[PDB]
Amino acid sequence: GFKQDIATLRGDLRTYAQDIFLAFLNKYPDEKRNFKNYVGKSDQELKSMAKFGDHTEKVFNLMMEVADRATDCVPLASDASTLVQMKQHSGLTTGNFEKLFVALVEYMRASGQSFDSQSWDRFGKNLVSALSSAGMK
């Protein structure tokens, strides 16, 4: 279930982080505007750069902490507030997060492994509603 999936992702976090972030950028090419430095590069070109993996790994470490602290796939309000207030997230809206979790669930369903894709879809929806309650437009 959801708790085991956190362990699966953590066990090979740098690899999963890169693959899931590429699935997001490829599904929603207009989202690369938040990431101007990745424009004009294929998947393999992005992965060869240490900065890409370094950054994504740190992102997914925080995502897994939020997921592990959730109750029944409902994140804590205090974790949603951290995500809203981070300077790096200034001017994001909840739709950016909605799209990230649609891509993440699609990746899990195509992987042919035993992810609890329903729990992740629910986590993404509950994270969007928590971000709005914590002040994100």
Place this chain on the structure above:
Amino acid sequence: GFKQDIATLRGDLRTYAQDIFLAFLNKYPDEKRNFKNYVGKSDQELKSMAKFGDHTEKVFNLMMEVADRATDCVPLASDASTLVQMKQHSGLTTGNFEKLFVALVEYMRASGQSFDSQSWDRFGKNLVSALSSAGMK
């Protein structure tokens, strides 16, 4: 304390993992008997070898999970059974693990941060005793 230290290490895991594992190999150079490929290499040459980067990341990803599942720095018996039975660990004895943790604790004490070094010393001793009970020589 110990739980916060897991969060500290996870926030810069790649760099902490390679640095601690290098501290282990430089304190105990005979431990290269298990890593014949690492002979004749400086730290900066090891860091640019793909499989050094791979073992080391996966060592620390899993070690952080074992730490997180522990109670008062005592690991789960099931976690010890998994570590003993890994086909990659067939040539190992508990002394290989003891030495890793002696190096890890020395690294934390020298860092000048706020690690709970005493807790990591207990965790390494308790992991060793759990590995023995699970079947490691």
